[PDB]
Structure 1
Amino acid sequence: GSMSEQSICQARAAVMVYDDANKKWVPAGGSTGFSRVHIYHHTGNNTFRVVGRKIQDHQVVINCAIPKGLKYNQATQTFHQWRDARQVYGLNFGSKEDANVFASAMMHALEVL
């Protein structure tokens, strides 16, 4: 992408989505494992997105917009979640620091938007 989109946070987390029909969390992209998850700020239009890529093979497993007003829920000290119309996303962070720094960056983003 272009240089006007910049990463403002990176954390290690396993990305899950909620299978609405089976009432179970499943790995984003089909295989359980940790990803490197960034919050990218596109400075041109002041928008944000989350993109995560598996660490072991760089599969892109999440690429989702963070709109104004998004509700970000810290369900546990290492599992955080949010929605869009298509999926509920969950991040199982690799450590409490990963979770807390990612959440702080998300909250700062929600205030910038």
Structure 2
Amino acid sequence: AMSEQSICQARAAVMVYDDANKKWVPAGGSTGFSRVHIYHHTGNNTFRVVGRKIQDHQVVINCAIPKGLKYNQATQTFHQWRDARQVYGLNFGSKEDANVFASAMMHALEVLGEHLPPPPMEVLMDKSFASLES
């Protein structure tokens, strides 16, 4: 009840977008792959994405998933969404990881309801995070 089960695990390079200089930067400040989970909170029926660098366990994404999140499959292997502070981009090691992770995210959202392109307006202007923390 006060614990979270992993419903999905994917390996990915976690990026964050820099609005002012219009480029993607590695989340946490260092290149490298992360292990990214979608966690379901058994008691509260909420979901969270948690990504940690494989090398040193640095937490580079810890993001509540709100009803209505805009999850953009920009390419077969690069998917984007945002929270109140940052715009994330997951560059998956493989189309298979990406398909699994996107599928799990879309299911969670149903329950709740130069190689890399920039985030579109629907992502940049997503206010779904505003339905939380109030």
TM range (shorter): over 0.9
C-alpha RMSD of matched pairs (Å): 2.6
Gapped regions of structure 2 (runs ≥ 5):
111-132
Give me the whole-angstrom Cα distance separating, in 1, the residues matched to 2:17 and 2:3: 32
Q: Which has the higher strand share?
A: 1
SS in 1 for 2:75: coil
Tell me how far 1:3 sits from its aligned partner: 5.8
Deviation larger for 67-76 or 103-112: 103-112
Tell me how far 1:84 sits from its aligned partner: 1.7
Gapped regions of structure 1 (runs ≥ 5):
none
Tell me how far 1:44 sits from its aligned partner: 1.2
Tell me how far 1:68 sits from its aligned partner: 0.8
List aligned pairs for 1:1-113, cutoff 5 A: 4-111=3-110
SS in 2 for 1:22: coil
Tell me how far 1:83 sits from its aligned partner: 1.4
Tell me how far 1:102 sits from its aligned partner: 0.3
- Stretches (4+) displaced over 2 A: none
Tell me the TM-score normalised to structure 1 length.
0.93
Tell me the TM-score normalised to structure 2 length.
0.79
SS in 2 for 1:85: coil
Q: Deviation string for 1:53-83 (max 9, x for gaps)?
A: 0111111111011011111010000000001
Give the length in aligned residue pairs. 112
Q: Deviation string for 1:78-106 (max 9, x for gaps)?
A: 00000122111000000000100000000
Determine which structure has more spread, i.e. the larger CA radius of gyration: 2
2:4 and 2:42 in contact (8 A); partners too: yes
Question: Identity of paired residues, percent?
Answer: 97
Tell me how far 1:4 sits from its aligned partner: 2.7
